[PDB]
Every structure is written in structure tokens, then in C-alpha cells.
């Protein structure tokens, strides 16, 4: 094991720790591609966590800026050195959309003084900053020749996964004093998340939840229809990652939309999905 390997293996640990699903899918990529993904994932995970004040965040940001400006110089990274070395090594061979990390970093900064979304258009803006940006950074890894269509599809996939994540985590987020459903849509469907956390699901809530789930499902179908924008090796894997995340919607439904635990797709169910897709390819 060279030193860079240990850097990547650390990246890998972070990704697996955070997301059993994406790990399960993206570890199936060829070596070169999966290691790039681990590294991009780890950076983004670290940015997601950096607050816990903004000092570590500013350090990650400066690290990323050094890499962009001086891809081939040795840096003394201020933040997490194993992660940034791996990102640097990625950027020496692929085209990183640096503005997409900055967009993510700005969104994390802002989430500091979070106030509920007035409308869905703000909510979908947040899904872009926290996740669409991530799909954009991955685009060169996952496709042979990047065009605007490839970015578009990857950005939609990211935003959709983010919205599914929001749908899974309503109760956990409410505990951490966050609600991501828009005020407009909460008022329209007659829902009060505090009330629902207290007394359980009713029909208004289910209707509201299902309004957003149908958006997530439509976007997912639109992505699957355009899956050819990606490299042949990544196609089945992106289809796996998406199907696994999507299934989360059916898990929520089966737990009657509970606000009191995180539902999950069993590892054994992941393997079933892989089989179904492996055999279409
Ligand atoms: C797999 C494609 C195309 C995009 C990624 C999908 C996606 C960013 C999130 C969905 N699951 C929650 C992850 N939210 C993201 C933010 C917080 C963690 C660190 C960064 C920023 C990456 C993700 C985890
Ligand atoms: Mg966040």
C-alpha cells in the first residue's frame, strides 16, 4: 500500500461510514473511478460537517482554492490532509468543477442562519447547493465526454437524492430544529410539523409528503431515461445508486411515514436491486 492508497482508503471509510447505499453502488466502479468518487465524497462530507464555528470550513475552502490555483505544487493543507491530497491527485487527472465545491461551501455557510423556505423554489435551490453541485463535480468521473446534458442529468440526480433524503429524515431534522418543506406548501396542505411530530401522521401530512415524493420519483424517471449520458461502466452503477435511494421512499411508506426513526434499505435488499439491474446489462 503506497501512501496515496491510505489517503484514498481513508476517503473510502468516510463514505461508507456516512452512506451505506452510495458506498454499496459506487464501490462497484473500476478502481480509477471509484477512488475519485471516494475522494470527492469525503471532501463534501467534511464540508457538510465542518461547523458541528466557520474556521474549519474556511480552511477546507482555502485548501480547495490552493489545489485549483496550483494543482501540481506541494501544499501544507490546513484542514484534512489525507482528503485534500486525494482530491489533489484526482484533479491532476480529471477536470474538477471547482465552482461547484464553492457553491456547496456557500450553502453550508448559509445554513448557519437558516430560516425556513418560503416557497418550493427556495427548497429546490437548497437541493441544488447541497447536492446538485455534487452531481456536477462527479460528472467528469462518471462520463466519457461531458456536455451540458451530462451535467444537467447528474445535477438532477443529485437534487432528487437530496429530496429523498429530506423525505426520509423529517423527524430527525425536526429534532435538530430544521424543517425543509416550504412554508407555502405547509400552509397549502394544512400541516404543522411540530404538531405532526407530537400526534402522529394524518392525511394532510401524507398528502404533503406524497406531493414531494412524486416530484422525486418523476425526476428519477427522467434521469433513468437519460442514463446513456454516462460511461457504460457507470450506467448500471448509477442506476443501482438511484434505485437503492429511491426504495427509501417505499420504506418510509411501509413504516407509515413515521417521524420517530430513520428507515433504511437492508443490505440484502440492495443486493436484490443489484441483481435486477446487473441482469438488464
Ligand atoms: C450521488 C449523486 C449524483 C449526488 C450526491 C447525492 C447527495 C449529495 C446527497 C444525497 N444524500 C445526502 C448527501 N447530501 C450531500 C451533502 C451532505 C453529504 C456530503 C456531501 C454534501 C455529499 C452528500 C452527502
Ligand atoms: Mg446541510
UniProtKB/Swiss-Prot annotation:
It is an enzyme of class 2 (transferase). GO terms for biological process: carotenoid biosynthetic process. (2E,6E)-farnesyl diphosphate 2 binds at residues 45, 162. Its cofactor is Mg(2+). One of its GO terms (molecular function) is metal ion binding. The keyword Chloroplast does not apply. Binds 2 Mg(2+) ions per subunit. A third Mg(2+) ion binds between the 2 farnesyl diphosphate (FPP). Pathway: Carotenoid biosynthesis; staphyloxanthin biosynthesis; staphyloxanthin from farnesyl diphosphate: step 1/5. Mg(2+) 2 binds at residues 165, 169. Involved in the biosynthesis of the yellow-orange carotenoid staphyloxanthin, which plays a role in the virulence via its protective function against oxidative stress. Catalyzes the head-to-head condensation of two molecules of farnesyl diphosphate (FPP) into the colorless C(30) carotenoid 4,4'-diapophytoene (dehydrosqualene). This is 4,4'-diapophytoene synthase. It comes from Staphylococcus aureus. The gene is crtM.
Amino acid at each position: 500500500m503506497t501512501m496515496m492508497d491510505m489517503n484514498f482508503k481513508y476517503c473510502h471509510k468516510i463514505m461508507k461510514k456516512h452512506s451505506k447505499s452510495f458506498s454499496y453502488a459506487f464501490d462497484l466502479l473500476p478502481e480509477d473511478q471509484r477512488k475519485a468518487v471516494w475522494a470527492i465524497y469525503a471532501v463534501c462530507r467534511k464540508i457538510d460537517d465542518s461547523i458541528d464555528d466557520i474556521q474549519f470550513l474556511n480552511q477546507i475552502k482555502e485548501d480547495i482554492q490552493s489545489i485549483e490555483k496550483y494543482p501540481y505544487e506541494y501544499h501544507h493543507f490546513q484542514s484534512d490532509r489525507r482528503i485534500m491530497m486525494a482530491l489533489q491527485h484526482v484533479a491532476q487527472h480529471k477536470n474538477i468543477a471547482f465552482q461547484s465545491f464553492y457553491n456547496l461551501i456557500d450553502t453550508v455557510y448559509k445554513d448557519q442562519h437558516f430560516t425556513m423556505f418560503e416557497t418550493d423554489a427556495e427548497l429546490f435551490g437548497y437541493c441544488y447547493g447541497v447536492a446538485g453541485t455534487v452531481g456536477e463535480v462527479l460528472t467528469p468521473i462518471l462520463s466519457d465526454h461531458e456536455t451540458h446534458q451530462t451535467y444537467d442529468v447528474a445535477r438532477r440526480l443529485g437534487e432528487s437524492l437530496q429530496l429523498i433524503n429530506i423525505l426520509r429524515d423529517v423527524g430527525e431534522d425536526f429534532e435538530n430544529e430544521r424543517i425543509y418543506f416550504s412554508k407555502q406548501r405547509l400552509k397549502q396542505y394544512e400541516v404543522d410539523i411540530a404538531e405532526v411530530y407530537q400526534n402522529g401522521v394524518n392525511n394532510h401530512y401524507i398528502d404533503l409528503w406524497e406531493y414531494y415524493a412524486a416530484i422525486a420519483e418523476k425526476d428519477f424517471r427522467d434521469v433513468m431515461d437519460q442514463i446513456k449520458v454516462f460511461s457504460i461502466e457507470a450506467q448500471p452503477i448509477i442506476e443501482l445508486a438511484a434505485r437503492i435511494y429511491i426504495e427509501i421512499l417505499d420504506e418510509v411508506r411501509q413504516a407509515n411515514y413515521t417521524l420517530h426513526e430513520r428507515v433504511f434499505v437492508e443490505k440484502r435488499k440492495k443486493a436484490k436491486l443489484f441483481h435486477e439491474i446487473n441482469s438488464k446489462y
